[PDB]
Each structure stands twice: as C-alpha cells, then as structure tokens.
C-alpha cells in the first residue's frame, strides 16, 4: 500500500488535484496507514487510487471463491490506471477550457451585436428627423430649379432610410434567432466552474474503468464502478453521477463511426470499443 501511494503521489504530482475548500469527512476511508490525519485533496485522491487497486484484488478473490476464472492484477495495472488518470484529466480539462473560451467569445460577439442594434436605433432616429426637416423645407420652398434638386435629395434620404430600415429588421431578426443560443451558452458558462470541480473524480472513475474493468462482465463491472463511486462519496470527492461512462469517454461521432464498423449497439460493446481506443 505504501508503494502504491508513493507511485500515485509521484506520478500525479503535476496534476492540479488541489481543492482549498476540501472538507475532510469525519470517517475517512483510510486505506494507507501512514496517511496524514487531516488529509488534503491530493492525498485523498491517491488514497482512492490505492483503494481501487485493492478493490480489484478483492473482486478477483470473490471470483476465485465462487469458482470463476480470474486474471492476475499486477502493478502494471496500477501504472496503466494512473497513466489513464493523468491523460483523461489533461484531455477533459483542455476540452472544457477550450469550450468555455469559445462560448465567451460568442457571448461577447452577441453583446457587441445588441449594442450595435441600439446604435442603429439612434442612427435611424437621426435619419428620420433629417428626412422630416428636409421634406418640410421642400414643401415650404415649393409653395412660394433648386427645389427639384432638394426634393430629389429628399427622395435620396428616403431611400437611405428604407435601406437602414431593412438593415434594422434583418439585424433584429438575426438577434432574436440567437436568443436560445445565448441562453444555452450563458447557462453552460455559469456551470463551467462546477464542471471544473468534478474533473478529478470523473477522470479517476473513468481511468479505473478503462484500466481494470476490461476483463469482467457487466455485472462485476457495475459492482466495481459502484464500489469506487461509494468510496469517492465517503472521501468527499466530487464526481458526476448523472452522465454515463460511455457518453463521458466518447463523442457521438465516434459512436456513429463504430456502428458503421458493425459494433453492436450495446453499452458493454461501447465500453470495449473505448478500451480498444484509449
């Protein structure tokens, strides 16, 4: 257990894994004996990794007791687990940061757009006022050659106002369309901070599933996942309990491509394809 904890600490040293507001549970699931009494977030993460590795041994012992077939769980399994953890953490963090950057740029563009809508409002008001004074002067001077010139300028102002009104309604139609888009982007940007906090637990669970749960059937894959989730809950490590692991570890384009490659439409088959990928 000490060797596993040291390997986890040294390997995940450049991972962020820092939660200043971490709340230590009253009953910590102490797996490593020499773990500090008020453990930090990183120490809890490494303890969870060691717990996962030992949970695989417990599962193999259970299968052996029931008279089933087991594969040996070696330290190379732990090394793959931490490799997957680091890679998944980096990849998910980069993807979410890039998505939030794109959303911020889009929202800024929309806000600039609505400010320009207001500026077109004021431009249209000025254009209407000058058209009114122009045709008023035209009617005044026409009831007393240059008069034809100025009424032609009045029609020119009218044409400009009509073009500006076309720009008005076209732009306003464009803004109203992007109301749902801006609403969704604002919601996702607000929930960005919460998503960042659950990357550690989600990536730990997904990495453990990829590294360990490959050989087992769906029942014991689910048993292992539930055990790991319960341990993470007991250690006050945030993870998302709503998303499916197949959805988390793959994008819809890859799932469509696999179906075109005659992959059965099964959750276990999708997990197997993910393992064959990562």
């Amino acid at each position: 257990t000490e060797a596993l904890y040291q390997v986890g600490k040294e390997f995940t040293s450049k991972m962020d894994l820092e939660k200043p507001n971490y709340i230590v549970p009253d009953y910590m699931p102490v797996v490593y004996d020499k773990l500090p009494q008020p453990p930090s977030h990183r120490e809890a993460i490494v303890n969870s990794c060691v717990f996962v590795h030992q949970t695989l041994h417990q599962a193999n012992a259970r299968l052996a007791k029931r008279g089933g077939r087991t594969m040996a769980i070696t330290p190379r399994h732990y090394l793959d687990f931490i490799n997957h953890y680091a890679n998944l953490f980096h990849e998910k963090r980069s993807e979410l940061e890039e998505q939030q950057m794109h959303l911020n740029v889009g929202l800024r563009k929309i806000k600039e757009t609505v400010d320009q809508v207001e500026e077109l409002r004021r431009d249209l008001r000025i254009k209407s006022q000058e058209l009114e004074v122009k045709n008023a002067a035209a009617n005044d001077k026409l009831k007393k050659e240059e008069y034809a010139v100025l009424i032609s300028e009045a029609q020119a102002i009218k044409a400009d106002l009509a073009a500006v009104e076309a720009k008005v309604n076209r732009s306003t139609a464009l803004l109203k369309s992007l109301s749902a888009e801006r609403e969704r982007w604002e919601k996702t940007s607000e929930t960005f901070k919460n998503q960042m906090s659950t990357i550690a637990g989600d990536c730990l669970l997904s990495a453990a599933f990829i590294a360990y749960a490959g050989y087992f059937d769906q029942q014991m894959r689910q048993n292992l996942f539930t055990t790991w989730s319960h341990h993470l809950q007991q250690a006050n490590i945030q993870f998302r309990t709503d998303i499916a692991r197949t959805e988390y570890l793959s994008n819809a384009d890859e799932r469509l491509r696999w179906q075109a490659s005659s992959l059965p439409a099964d959750d276990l088959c999708t997990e197997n394809a993910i393992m064959l990928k990562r």
Partner: protein
C-alpha cells in the same frame, strides 16, 4: 551601460491572433514570453525570433505574466478571474488559484519566490501562496480598478496603481498603506520601481538630501494616461521630476538596467527614451502601426521587446 534601442529591427514576431497585452524576458534563458488577448501565452526565442510553444490553459484574455527569481515558475492572470501558475520546466499548469472577483489586471511574484500578489477590478490586491494556493491576507483601500502591482527587490513593499488616481504603497508585515499618493491629472496605468544601480544617480538628478541613515530611500514611479511620467519617493511621498512630452496614453514604464535612462511606451505608436539627470536623451522611435501595449528590457543582453495591439511582438537591438 548605454544600451539604447535603434530604429532598425531584427524580428517582428506575429503568431498571436489577438492584441498582445504584455511581454517579459526570462531571467536566465534566451526566452521571451508574450501574453495576449486570445487566452494564450506564447514563448519565443528573441535571439533568433523563433516561435517555441504556447500555453493555452487560460479561458479569457491573459493580462499580465511574471517570472520568479529562478525563472522556474510563471504566474499568469486573465479576465477569467483566476491566477494560473505555470511550471516552466514542463510548461504545464500546476496550480489555478481562484477567487479575486472580476477581471484580474496584474500579477507579480516577489523575489522571495514563495508568494504572489495580484490586482483586479474588485478594488483590492490579494496575497497568495505559491506552495499551497490559499489567499492569506487581502489588501483594501483602493476605491476603483487597480491596474498594475509591483513589489520591491526583497519582498517587503508593494505599490498598486488604480483608476482612482492613487498609487498606494503597501507593507507586507503591517498591511498598512504607509504612503498614499493622489496627485495625477488622469488615470494612472503603469508603475515600476528603481533598481539599486540607479539610487546614487537620483541624488544629482534631483538634489534630494540624504537622511540620518544616509540612504536615499526606496523609489517609485507611476505612468498615467495624462501623458505624463512622474517618479516618486516611497520614503517621503513628494515629487522628484515630471516627464512630459508623450502624445498619447502611456501604458508601460521601466528603467534601464544601467540605471541612467528612462525608456517607456505609450499609445502614441512610438517608443520614447528619455534622460532625467540632464534631459539630453529624448529619442522618439516608432515601433508599431497601431497602439503599443507593453515592453521589457533585458537585464544583461542588449535587447528590448515590445507588444502591440497589432498582434505583433518586435525585438529591438540596443546599441
């Protein structure tokens, strides 16, 4: 040393897709680091002008970057309300300290290399720990957006310039503004203190009298949008000399490594080198086609870099 930039250039680095916000020099390596408004920090080799790598961990526009004494860490601030600490050996973000509401404007690591300072729109300056990441003490007293923050050469004194026309010098131990300066005509934007190599050069430049201890005292400077550059005495708080002649808002100020000349940038699209001891050097040097944002002076090499709104970073030879 009489290093002075020359109008001819060597490389005009252009890889950023957004206006450049700040440029700094690596303490030891031949590496120049530029932070821009596209949420990315780029790494360049100023000797041969070759792009090296980018650090794309930030969410919103990156505002200010700063190295430590050893150059092994890079602290960055952005508009995404966060301070990211970069490990310059592997170039991967290692600690992202949160808090410090609204846009963060400035960041700086004091020479002791264990704590960070940062300035933001929330009218306060915070004090973080590199090793752990908790904000331990918070500086309050600025009533507006604080633009730039710069510490001393031994990690004890801090100055902060804000939109409130005040440049308040702070103390680490007592957390009290022992010197408050509110005398500028318009918004103060950039500050930079004096190296010990120029402390003697201020005595004959201004005529100040040494105290009983004999030391001239720590020195200050604050550039402002009023097109005036003013150098200040931290110990007393009174004016030494006002440097006037900039066409537009000044954005960056710093001292020559030899401690003899004044070299600064501004929104006037030109770089201006000024002398203060004798008012002889007044070289004006255009740098970019658009506004010029930030600049830096190499401690030992004869190189200066400038960042501009035209998404281009330029390197000038010092002769």
């Amino acid at each position: 040393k009489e290093w002075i930039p020359r109008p001819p250039e060597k490389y005009a680095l252009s890889g950023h897709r957004s206006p450049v916000t700040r440029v700094i020099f690596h303490p030891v390596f031949s590496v120049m680091v530029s932070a821009s408004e596209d949420a990315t920090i780029k790494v360049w080799d100023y000797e041969t002008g070759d792009f090296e790598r980018t650090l794309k961990g930030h969410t919103d526009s990156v505002q200010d970057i700063s190295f430590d004494h050893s150059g092994k860490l890079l602290a960055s601030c952005s508009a995404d309300m966060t301070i990211k600490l970069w490990d310059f050996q592997g170039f991967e973000c290692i600690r992202t300290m949160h808090g410090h509401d609204h846009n963060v404007s400035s960041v700086a690591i004091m020479p002791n290399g264990d704590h960070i300072v940062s300035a933001s729109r929330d009218k306060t300056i915070k004090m973080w720990e590199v090793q752990t990441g908790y904000c331990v003490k918070t500086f309050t007293g600025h009533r507006e957006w604080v633009r730039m923050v710069r510490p001393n050469q031994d990690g004890t004194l801090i100055a902060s310039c804000s939109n409130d026309q005040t440049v308040r010098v702070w103390v680490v131990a007592t957390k009290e503004c022992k010197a408050e300066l509110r005398e500028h005509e318009h918004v103060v934007e950039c500050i930079s203190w004096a190296p010990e190599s120029s402390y003697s050069s201020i005595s004959e430049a201004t005529g100040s009298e040494t105290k009983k201890s004999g030391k001239p005292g720590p020195f200050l400077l604050s550039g402002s949008r009023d097109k005036t550059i003013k150098m200040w005495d931290v110990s007393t708080g009174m004016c030494l000399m006002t440097l006037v002649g900039h066409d537009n808002w000044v954005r960056g100020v710093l001292f020559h490594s030899g401690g003899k000349f004044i070299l600064s940038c501004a929104d006037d699209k030109t770089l201006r080198v000024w002398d203060y001891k004798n008012k002889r050097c007044m070289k004006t040097l255009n740098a970019h086609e658009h506004f010029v944002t930030s600049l830096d002076f190499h401690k030992t090499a004869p190189y200066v870099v400038t960042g501009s709104v035209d998404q281009t970073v330029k390197v000038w030879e010092c002769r």
